Amino acid sequence: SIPWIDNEFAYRALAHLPKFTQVNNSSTFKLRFRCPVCGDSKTDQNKARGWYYGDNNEGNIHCYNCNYHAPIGIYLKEFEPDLYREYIFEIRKEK
Amino acid sequence: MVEIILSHLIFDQAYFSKVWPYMDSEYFESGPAKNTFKLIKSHVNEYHSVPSINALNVALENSSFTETEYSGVKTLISKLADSPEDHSWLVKETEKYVQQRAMFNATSKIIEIQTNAELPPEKRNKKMPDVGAIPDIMRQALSISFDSYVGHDWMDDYEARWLSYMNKARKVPFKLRILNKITKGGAETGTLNVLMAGVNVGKSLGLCSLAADYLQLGHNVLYISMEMAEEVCAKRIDANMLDVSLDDIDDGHISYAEYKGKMEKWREKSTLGRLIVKQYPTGGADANTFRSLLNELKLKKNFVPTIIIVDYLGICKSCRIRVYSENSYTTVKAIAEELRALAVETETVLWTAAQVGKQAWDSSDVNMSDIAESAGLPATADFMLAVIETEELAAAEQQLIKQIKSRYGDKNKWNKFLMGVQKGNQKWVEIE
Amino acid sequence: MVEIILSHLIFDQAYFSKVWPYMDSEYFESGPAKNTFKLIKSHVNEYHSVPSINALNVALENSSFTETEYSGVKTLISKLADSPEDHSWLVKETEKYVQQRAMFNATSKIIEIQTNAELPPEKRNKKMPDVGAIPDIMRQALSISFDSYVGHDWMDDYEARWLSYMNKARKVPFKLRILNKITKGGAETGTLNVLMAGVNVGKSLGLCSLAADYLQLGHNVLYISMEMAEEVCAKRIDANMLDVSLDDIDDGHISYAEYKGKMEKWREKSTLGRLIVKQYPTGGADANTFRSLLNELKLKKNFVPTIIIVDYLGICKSCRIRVYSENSYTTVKAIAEELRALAVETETVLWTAAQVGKQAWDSSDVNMSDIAESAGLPATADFMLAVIETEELAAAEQQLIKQIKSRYGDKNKWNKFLMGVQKGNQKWVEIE
Amino acid sequence: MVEIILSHLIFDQAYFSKVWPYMDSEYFESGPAKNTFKLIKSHVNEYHSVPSINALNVALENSSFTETEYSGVKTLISKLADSPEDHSWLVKETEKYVQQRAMFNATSKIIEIQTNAELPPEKRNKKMPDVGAIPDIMRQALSISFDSYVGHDWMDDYEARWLSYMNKARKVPFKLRILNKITKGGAETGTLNVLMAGVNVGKSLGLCSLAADYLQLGHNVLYISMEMAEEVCAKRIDANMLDVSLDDIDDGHISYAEYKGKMEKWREKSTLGRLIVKQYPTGGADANTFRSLLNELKLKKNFVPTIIIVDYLGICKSCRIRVYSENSYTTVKAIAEELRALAVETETVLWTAAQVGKQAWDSSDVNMSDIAESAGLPATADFMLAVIETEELAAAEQQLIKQIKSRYGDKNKWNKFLMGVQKGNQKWVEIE
Amino acid sequence: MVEIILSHLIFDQAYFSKVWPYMDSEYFESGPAKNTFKLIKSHVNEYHSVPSINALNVALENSSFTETEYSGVKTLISKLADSPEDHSWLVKETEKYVQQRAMFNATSKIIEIQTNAELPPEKRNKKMPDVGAIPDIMRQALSISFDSYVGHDWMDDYEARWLSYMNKARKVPFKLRILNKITKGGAETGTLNVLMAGVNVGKSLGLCSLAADYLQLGHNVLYISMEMAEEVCAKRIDANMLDVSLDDIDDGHISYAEYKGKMEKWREKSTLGRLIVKQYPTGGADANTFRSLLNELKLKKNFVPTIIIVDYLGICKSCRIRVYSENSYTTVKAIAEELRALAVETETVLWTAAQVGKQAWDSSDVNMSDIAESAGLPATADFMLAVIETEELAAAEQQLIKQIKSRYGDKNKWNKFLMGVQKGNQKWVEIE
DNA sequence: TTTTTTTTTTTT
DNA sequence: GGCTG
Ligand SMILES: Nc1ncnc2c1ncn2[C@@H]1O[C@H](COP(=O)(O)OP(=O)(O)OP(O)(O)=S)[C@@H](O)[C@H]1O
Ligand SMILES: Nc1ncnc2c1ncn2[C@@H]1O[C@H](COP(=O)(O)OP(=O)(O)OP(O)(O)=S)[C@@H](O)[C@H]1O
Ligand SMILES: Nc1ncnc2c1ncn2[C@@H]1O[C@H](COP(=O)(O)OP(=O)(O)OP(O)(O)=S)[C@@H](O)[C@H]1O
Ligand SMILES: [Mg+2]
Ligand SMILES: [Mg+2]
Numbered sequence A: 001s002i003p004w005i006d007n008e009f010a011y012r013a014l015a016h017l018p019k020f021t022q023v024n025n026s027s028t029f030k031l032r033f034r035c036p037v038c039g040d041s042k043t044d045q046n047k048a049r050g051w052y053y054g055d056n057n058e059g060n061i062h063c064y065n066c067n068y069h070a071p072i073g074i075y076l077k078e079f080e081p082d083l084y085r086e087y088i089f090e091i092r093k094e095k
Numbered sequence B, C, D, E: 001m002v003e004i005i006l007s008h009l010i011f012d013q014a015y016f017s018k019v020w021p022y023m024d025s026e027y028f029e030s031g032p033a034k035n036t037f038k039l040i041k042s043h044v045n046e047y048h049s050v051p052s053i054n055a056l057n058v059a060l061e062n063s064s065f066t067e068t069e070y071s072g073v074k075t076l077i078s079k080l081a082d083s084p085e086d087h088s089w090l091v092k093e094t095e096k097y098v099q100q101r102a103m104f105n106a107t108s109k110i111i112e113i114q115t116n117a118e119l120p121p122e123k124r125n126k127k128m129p130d131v132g133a134i135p136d137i138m139r140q141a142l143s144i145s146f147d148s149y150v151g152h153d154w155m156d157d158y159e160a161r162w163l164s165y166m167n168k169a170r171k172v173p174f175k176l177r178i179l180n181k182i183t184k185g186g187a188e189t190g191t192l193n194v195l196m197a198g199v200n201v202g203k204s205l206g207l208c209s210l211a212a213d214y215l216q217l218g219h220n221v222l223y224i225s226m227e228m229a230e231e232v233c234a235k236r237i238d239a240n241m242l243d244v245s246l247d248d249i250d251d252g253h254i255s256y257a258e259y260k261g262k263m264e265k266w267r268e269k270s271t272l273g274r275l276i277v278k279q280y281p282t283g284g285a286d287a288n289t290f291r292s293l294l295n296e297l298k299l300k301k302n303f304v305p306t307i308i309i310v311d312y313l314g315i316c317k318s319c320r321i322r323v324y325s326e327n328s329y330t331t332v333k334a335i336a337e338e339l340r341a342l343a344v345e346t347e348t349v350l351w352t353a354a355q356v357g358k359q360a361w362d363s364s365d366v367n368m369s370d371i372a373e374s375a376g377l378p379a380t381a382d383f384m385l386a387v388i389e390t391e392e393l394a395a396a397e398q399q400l401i402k403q404i405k406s407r408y409g410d411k412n413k414w415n416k417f418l419m420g421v422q423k424g425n426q427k428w429v430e431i432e
Numbered sequence F: 001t002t003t004t005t006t007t008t009t010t011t012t
Numbered sequence G: 001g002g003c004t005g
């Protein structure tokens, strides 16, 4: 897989999601966001349990509220198809 | 224009009648555009009528998707409203939209297949089609035009039907007179013909004799061997054409001068096609493999066959069922159906061999019930011929061919005749 | 959907005549909905008619409620419109709503019973039932379906039953006197009729003969081919109708003049119907495809078929089960059930063929147990005849037809009768 | 009182001997209690003795528990002590606690079932029982008690055996004396009786004959037909009772005057019941629908049946299992259990007709290894008969009954007897 | 666990005599536990007896330990109690502790050996074993078991085996002199014994006679019936035990007073066992359901049987075969193997019956070849008694018992013997 | 747990 | 204020 293009594409997709924070240390890339599937916690409006982990072989999104866990490609295919088109093309561009 | 399509699916009976049969869930936005259409499709499947706004709202309330999806569907439903329109602009625009979405989905799937096949094995996410069926998918993206063919009318369309009887381009004549007589003009294109003999009775000698006879009658023949080398089949064809026994070739009783002279004499004759022999490992070729072979033959070798021959269908792999998943019956029936589909697709006479059961071996008669691997093969085959050899027949250099399934004519007439197989020359000769 | 239920109670008599029998204040809510339904019930009790909006508002003014409930009832009453939704969907949805509310009430009741049981005997209420009443309470809430029809009575409805005896509109004659004799007036609409035999015995011959016989009687016949091409089957129909031959068509013995003359003479007949032949790839169609084909046929041409012939049920594809999800006994029976459902929906006589296992391919007789596919097909079938051909029969050109499953009449009155099958003309000839 | 239960399981022996076989892990909360009971149960299973405090502290250390679970279990073990009380209050208090826990678990389970049912398809959980299974669960929880009967204990249960010797259950007599002979006076009230047979051999003929015989004896008979129209079943009954062949009725040989005269002559007889025929679509009726039908029959027609007859068991809905969830065996067994429960609840003799397998078709003898859908039907049934009209009984206008399972008497006394089936009148006559 | 081990070394005798030879210093610790065990071992070596607490403290006072060691040993000595745990659990747990510690020590030793091996050869310890000694060392860790009993060791268990031959530890008498004569003292535990019934002999009469005889001898009998209810089998038992004829109970000749008096007279006798009759449907009880029944009886009824009598082997179901046939050889062979495995694993005498071959039915003599179950029952049966009932024997109220297979003793010693069968009381009496 | 094809084997 | 597989 190609991790840096997943980090670049994931950011834009999760940028729309509110409570968006870039948890980027010296060796990892994570994105904190409110989960778009369930709206995260109904009681707490300030909780961002949706996370993106791009330091692995494949950048994966995981929600700690509704237990959603998916790759960034499936997330883009299911929710942002205009972003999904260029994502797989830039993927083909470098592959 | 998804909102217009949904609105006129709801508030237009004429629009729904034409567009609905073709509308599919993969042609709108994955979100409400898809959720709203899924609601409508479920209502139509449950009640066979177009839902109203109240029905859509009720189905929306009795739905399990999240708050974002619920709000999107509610907004989309609230935005649906009938507008003064004309049937033509809507049908044409819907056709354009459906074609564009089909092309988009097809190219997305093509990219997915390409990026999946370029992965190390055992991690390639199986059940995804291989690159071989990349163009076929695109061919499915172009066959969507809101113009489904209802069918053929007996009385309305009979001039076109009559201009198919003297055409005779469907039938490909044999070279033996008896086979033409029983088939009333030879085999037909887009069919699946089968030879049932047993083990070491014939059944590849007959296929080679047919290939040679078709080759002499200006035909392009594609022999496909799943159990023999390309040089063994070519040696059989050489023995048939050059009238030199296989023993003479093995024992070196034919010189290079005679071989060269016979080959050049055959080449200089105008009435001769091209025969190409291709070998695949047993259980390693299917209909998709044969289509890829056809494409690469057309491109690289400008070779367009009409008499495609497969040595044994039972030795081939199904292109749909996973290996050793279903029993022999289902697998062999599927393989035969796929081969017949290939034959009708490329409009070629397809010839194949089939084994008989152990009980039919060394028997003076072979029935249709003696088919080995599946009872569906006789049902999905246009013509079948049973090759029977006994000790008396072997001593007479003859074999009894019984018409088991004769779809081109009446099998009761000329059911059993004696061919003069010559095993040294791999040739069938008549007795008339 | 309480608003819809109340609106169609007030503004629809047909809805009121099927739901009011089964309706209670506990089913709706504890707020404005229950109060509105209580007003409706009080008005209908005092005056045996459905109230109007003005009458309901006057009653609300007369009745006493607190401020909140008064405002809620006024707001809810303001929201009532005719909104002519479909009757079937409305009754199904209100049945579902009643069932779910009744289940919720029953669960709350049993929870209250359990809570009261744990209380000390002095504190506990004697009105609530014991725990032993938990099961039946949950059962009476599962028997609240909307169905007022109790059924026949055999003594209070014998006049209506006798009138039904005179309704012979379901029967469709056969054009063959023996088939009418054994079916007591021909086949019936909405029934699954099967013509089974071995491989290459004349199943499609019999189907085309039935199609031609129904065509000559003025019926609309829809022939759905699964193996042969449209022009091939139409050739068999031409051989049956024009009555010349199958080989003479392909051997040029018929001059165009004769073909045109015979076709125009058949066109001049006012007793002729319409025949449409549709071909599908093997394993790619079912009632879901057939229903769309029916809709397209009705839209494009004034063609509503009375007879629907399917070339083979086995070659067909089930709607819910995938191509190879389950074994033969299931998906074949599923396809049979779907075809019978399609026939009873369209009120058409459905004909199809069935294959016989290898055990009876060369036997003088065939039984019901000799069905190649699932044995559920000879459970959904209604008139499963059987075609048996031997050497003696083929010598006399007389196939034997055995009555295998006879739902219309007595299966054993004429169990085995000889036909006069002419294979060249693709015609069944009665024997006298 | 979980702490007391654990303390007296550890420190008391008579209490342990009395209550241990009925304790279960589901009766304890998920905190320290369930883990402590798990340790105790594992120790008892491994050493067949009650563990001490040291044993459990050793088992706790040798356990895969989290810090919270470990601390809770250790605290609970420390809190245990042998409080001296009476071994007559402890047992009843433990029984009450176990019953309350069982009721709580059943309530939670049915709430989960109802939540699962409302979910849309392709998302709802599979293998989870449907809504109709809710009462049965609630029937199981109420049956929990510290008294268990496993088998019949000689010298310990002999008063009940003497009662069984001296007393005989009430019997609803047949009209055929042979059935009374083989059943010692008829069939009991709360029973499920099955008349298995092959396809198109007289499943409905026998059921209609039984319905007519019971109707002539003054019983209220409900005929639930799942495959045939109401008029067809009522016509079978008319042929049975009016002594007119079905051929005569269809052909119109009998006039309306004769039909009315015979019907009124039957009406004037005091020894006549009421027969009500209700038709349901295939797979559209279940036990709860039957209960709703019974309720509406009682309320709107003052009709309480005794001889409820179901045409075919294999077509009815499961009422406990979602459609197309389990295999045929499990679904048919569930249907049989539901129907027998309905018969017991309504105190009605219930008669049905299952279908035998393809092997039993045209077989001169059948056994329990011939039932097609489910071999668990005999276990659930109370009397099961068979029909063996295969080849020569039809020519002789006779039948044969195997008596596969007879709980009313002994099956190996009159196991096979010949029945004079008359198909024109749809009745059974005796050969005597 | 170490505290318990030390405490029960100090305060027990059987535990000490059982576990002392397998106790080593390296098994405990490197701290207080090791020092305490060293004190115990030193005391037992100097004085061959278990030390007391005061003696242990005196030894600790007169010992070379530091302050921390002194404190640890003093605390551990003060933490030892004479509490009474069960012996089996204590031995098993200390065996597990010893095995775990030995495995840990061996693993650490091999790791240290490997670490020393990867060191400059000039610089390494000589005392450390070479790498090639690693597989043996682990073996010494795996060869640690407090008690070694793997099978029967000839020449090492001859004294125990002789106590078996003199005490007849395996034999179970018959109460019939002839049956004890031919079995050398009765049947054996863990055996399958079957009766072969010719035409005209019942299979349940002999089984009920054996059950009654075992009941009168004090054995717990579990009678599992297939074709009969619990009451009927217990009625046969009553007929044999109370001397009342079977038909007299049904007629009513015997009154409740005599029945109760005889039952209480039997109950007064202390030489009477318990009989538990359990009924199962035909084909619904494999030899895995019997295991569950035994578990339930042991847990709830505390009933652990010594005799298990199955009504009929043929009616049972083969768990391994799964599929069920009315009369199939493969199932009977599997059923016999499963029942004999159950008998072996439960240490019970298992009885069953079968029908002899038709040829055996006609012939008074029955050959192992003349058996319905051939090579299946005379291969898995320790004893197979054959019962012959001819006309002359029936007229004399007798049955000829023939011995067809006797694993117990010589088959030809006393092969034929006449038995006094009473069919009314269901009894076998001897013949002088 | 049944169902259906094909084969191979074996038992009666 | 982070936490998955
Ligand atoms: N090299 C050869 N020389 C002479 N005769 C041969 C030679 N090869 C085959 N034959 C003869 O041809 C007969 C049939 O050959 P084939 O066509 O290979 O039989 P087959 O049925 O195709 O074999 P299988 O079992 O289907 S792979 C044999 O029985 C031989 O008598
Ligand atoms: N072109 C033809 N000319 C003459 N007779 C023919 C011709 N085609 C078929 N037949 C005869 O038709 C008989 C059976 O016809 P079919 O319809 O092929 O039987 P069927 O195989 O059961 O039907 P299918 O498989 O759906 S085509 C054969 O035995 C032939 O005798
Ligand atoms: N109209 C009729 N006139 C005379 N005999 C008939 C008539 N209808 C049916 N029969 C006969 O009645 C027999 C039994 O039919 P059914 O009562 O339907 O048995 P069945 O088991 O219910 O059939 P199914 O439901 O399709 S499996 C048939 O085999 C026919 O011989
Ligand atoms: Mg070959
Ligand atoms: Mg065919």
Ligand SMILES: [Mg+2]
Residues within 6 Å of the ligand: D203, D204, D227, D311
């Ligand atoms: Mg019926």
